[model samples]
Target: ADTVVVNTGKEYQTIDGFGGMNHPEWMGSDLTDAQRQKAFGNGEDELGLTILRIFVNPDSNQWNKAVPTAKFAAQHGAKVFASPWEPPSNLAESDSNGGKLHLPKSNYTAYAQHLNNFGTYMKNQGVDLYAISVQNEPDYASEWTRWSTDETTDFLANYADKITSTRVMSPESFQYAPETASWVADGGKKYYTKILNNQKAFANCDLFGTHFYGTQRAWMDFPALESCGKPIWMTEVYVPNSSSDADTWPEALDVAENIHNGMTVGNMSAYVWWYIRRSYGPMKENGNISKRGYMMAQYSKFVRPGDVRIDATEQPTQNVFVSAYKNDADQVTIVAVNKTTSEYNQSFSMGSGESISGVTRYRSSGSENLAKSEISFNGTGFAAQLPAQSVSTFVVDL
Candidate 1:
């Protein structure tokens, strides 16, 4: 708990969208259309979010039923984007579904066209997805579908009549597994060559997508890839150890640190969570909010779409992670994470570059509603007890 004043002078990054599962087919009838709409907007509305990443599964019956989720995203005023994990086995070269990126060299045209049709289908339903990822985790094949670098890049390069004919393409989404990440069955570190190791093939794709699986692989290699000049986006990631009886300290603090570390060094412009409604989610499937929900609320709620992330000085303790953002209105929002095991006083200051006041603090810890806390800045800095295991958003008008 130390005090520092950091002023954001009108700089922020583009926030693509918050992510959620679009299980329209499995759970369509479980929730009404109104309920679905509510679920789609409630988090973003209350948290001031605008972009959404809707998951799609083309290998199963789910493919044809993305309407419910896609429609829900559109109704909520969020720029909707869609991504598929795997295509049907019939569409693969390995004949093993989407697991190994079995896309036959011949099927490249068909795959692009087929995916484009998916985008077109969403448009026909009155919702246009903002973008699409070529595959979820290309290096890792699964029961769902197999995908790989060559296949993903090949399809992206064609951007042929099949897809462009129907919808404009998103920057190519490569299934990037940096060398040092975790749980990547393909093993650690070596995976770097899978994507970064083979930059020449995937040079044409638009974005680099990967999951934050408990490690900082994304940051380790970002400096080298910066030359690629594509927007580095973390497509799917979450607080893995989130539990039913979790405390706010580690859950909120860890995520805050992780996001801060990821975005700052990785030059990550966008960070997408895995599921918005899981026990580990910002919101539960039952519409209940988890501590993780509040963690997301702390940042996703205040950081509007198109907000910029200014540089936040890293503190001595990893327990606390800090990030700042600014909006079109010249408003500065600072998100601080207190991951310590206990509540303690934390302080920060705004550099004298700008006049700031009315420091509003919104804190989420344990199961409480986001508590509104405020502090008056005497033009230097302010301090507050960053509740243990909590994520807090402190906003000031500059």
Candidate 2:
């Protein structure tokens, strides 16, 4: 309804990427080549996802099955990182609640060697991992390995360096709530603080990782996290118990809003989804791109890694969410979401007196899967009618 101005001069985090997991045993793992192309291909034809979260199973059976697809993504310049959901059964703790692993002090070296073996195995398959996490959602005790704050700290302190060939990540906190704060704060077990205080442990951690679910996404003092000079990645996120309608406005808008908050509010360097394909996955179970997929493409397709999210100020509107980015190519991308039931004619600009001459727009709404739209730029800036409950991306060439 009103002008949403973007200030390119004020930039935030350098985006690492946006992507979803593609586990070998997942529903979408058997997708055809065309399907894979639609999911990972660069340019306008695909979502342009530059990251793929690979699940590191306990053995090579699952890992090897994922290798071909992981290699496909890597061939397209997409980074592949692995997170283990469970350790070898023999080395893990068994419980009716769920399988968990707490490696004994003596077995710690063997476990570290196990992870390194995985990295080496993948490298042999021509899929070099960008990074690896000790555990996924470690805070949530489940059938999987459950590492307490102290266990996580001790692991990082003692054996993280033993993880060879790839960088190591830790304590993938399940939620971004006070629990996470306590882990990082001064008085608590200080899982995070322990890592920061120990140079060797801190050195092994290339990125501070966390997942946002069942909690609010609040601003973590990015300045403090940035002091360590490492990027904070929202490695996993999803709206649980939500609609599975990939072509609808309400469901798709929910995800777009998450991405907006992850960037503007949380200042996350990257945003990753839970999985690549499902009945409601961005890439539908049938291999066709869904509305949810298109919503992700608005940001994932245009705003690439090395791009900097810039400042964007929007007029008073409770339904509209806006964020902007400028890439290494000097192209500016503006992502806007209209969650209300009424359409609004939105206006926007670079806000720094920079003349934006040419523009291309794509949108995802009812009956549209991020289809290119017709738009026009006025003298002051550009204006477009944002459909009710829709997400749009405006790519401006400088």
Candidate 3:
């Protein structure tokens, strides 16, 4: 493949982190004070994630199982947000048969109160949440939830009016695709009027949250959403279905493409992952450490919080993606991910009237799971033999 050149870009919202997988019992006994620091902070030397998301399902089983995971996430430097797929069984029209888009009109008030109570509980537990969404992926919810965007809009409105002091409201989450386009478009065409009207339903949101399951198709071009004037965030996305043959390079490449496309067109503020500790995680659940984990280290480990994306561009032949950012220390970091099956001989050039010296490159490649490997860089552009599939972070002195 040919070398790709890219100019970096940065957006302000913190990178979002989702903790607590579908099962919580897997965490294994870390509720006590002794284990708290080891589990959450690990050590002051390692940086903690900035934003963490927790799922609060309507089912007591889901709620009970996710508790420990939620607690651990909060202990780190994350502002927790809770989102649910369904209300308690009684709140649904057919409690025994939960279905998608089936929230009863009568249960609106009760559903709002349930979310408020969860917020209150978290607060009482000494953890202050940053926000709450009415529901997660209501459009295609399975037997686990009964919801509708219209009802979800109403729920969010109620929370904003009633619980503004507690946390901001994010409604109708994770409606990715082509899937989320319908809300802003009429079948295929853009529908600004409908979105404008829908925006009225969610009058109190500080940020508009969503996910990216499908590619950035025609739906992202909807002016209605951009015109609605709400901040956007890509809250969820990941690598592949089967974990058996997963590798870090593919995951890193997927993420790079996701960031480029989402940030470029969706105008999304933040890009969040499903599980930061999964098999696809930059850090494995058992801490065996994979390149995917280091791929995360390429970003979260260096991007830091509050860094602004400046600009970046990748040549088509490279099959590689690039994103750049500048931190508080005036240090410039460019993250490059090669999705190819062969090594990449990459070159980077800095423009901005600033000379880049003492450039240090850190890479996590190889078919192995690694996060702390360091590489050497000699000039403005260095020959980065990025492994067949891998994520690499470059730190430049500006």
How far residue 336's Cα lies from its native spot in candidate 2, in Å, is 0.6
- By TM-score rank, best first, the candidates go 2, 1, 3
RMSD to native for every prediction?
Answer: 4.1, 3.1, 4.8
Q: Residue 33: error of model 3 in Å? A: 9.5
Candidate 3 wrongly placed segments (more than 4 Å): 1-48, 59-68, 95-101, 157-159, 172-175, 179-199, 216-230, 242-256, 259-265, 275-285, 315-318, 368-383
Candidate 3 lDDT tens digits, 1-398: 44334333434333333222223333343234333332234343232345556667676544544455566666676556766766787776553433544667677777777777777766766667667776666544555464544455555555355664355545444444453454432111111222346555546556666655554544454455655656666566664432632353455556555555565456565656665555665345554434544444456656655676666664334556667777778887777766778774766665444555666776656644324444445544445666666667777776
lDDT at position 81, candidate 1:
67
What TM-score do all the candidates reach, one by one? 0.82, 0.90, 0.77
Candidate 2 residue spans exceeding 4 A from truth: 26-29, 43-45, 95-99, 180-194, 219-223, 240-245, 314-316, 378-380
lDDT of 1 at 233: 66
What is the C-alpha RMSD, rounded to one decimal, of candidate 2? 3.1
Please, what are the lDDT tens digits per residue for candidate 2 over residues 60-169? 56667778778899999888888887777667665443335555556677777778888888899998888888778666755566666667777887887889877787
Candidate 2 pairs with clashing backbones: 98-143, 99-143
Count of steric clashes across candidates, in order? 31, 2, 15
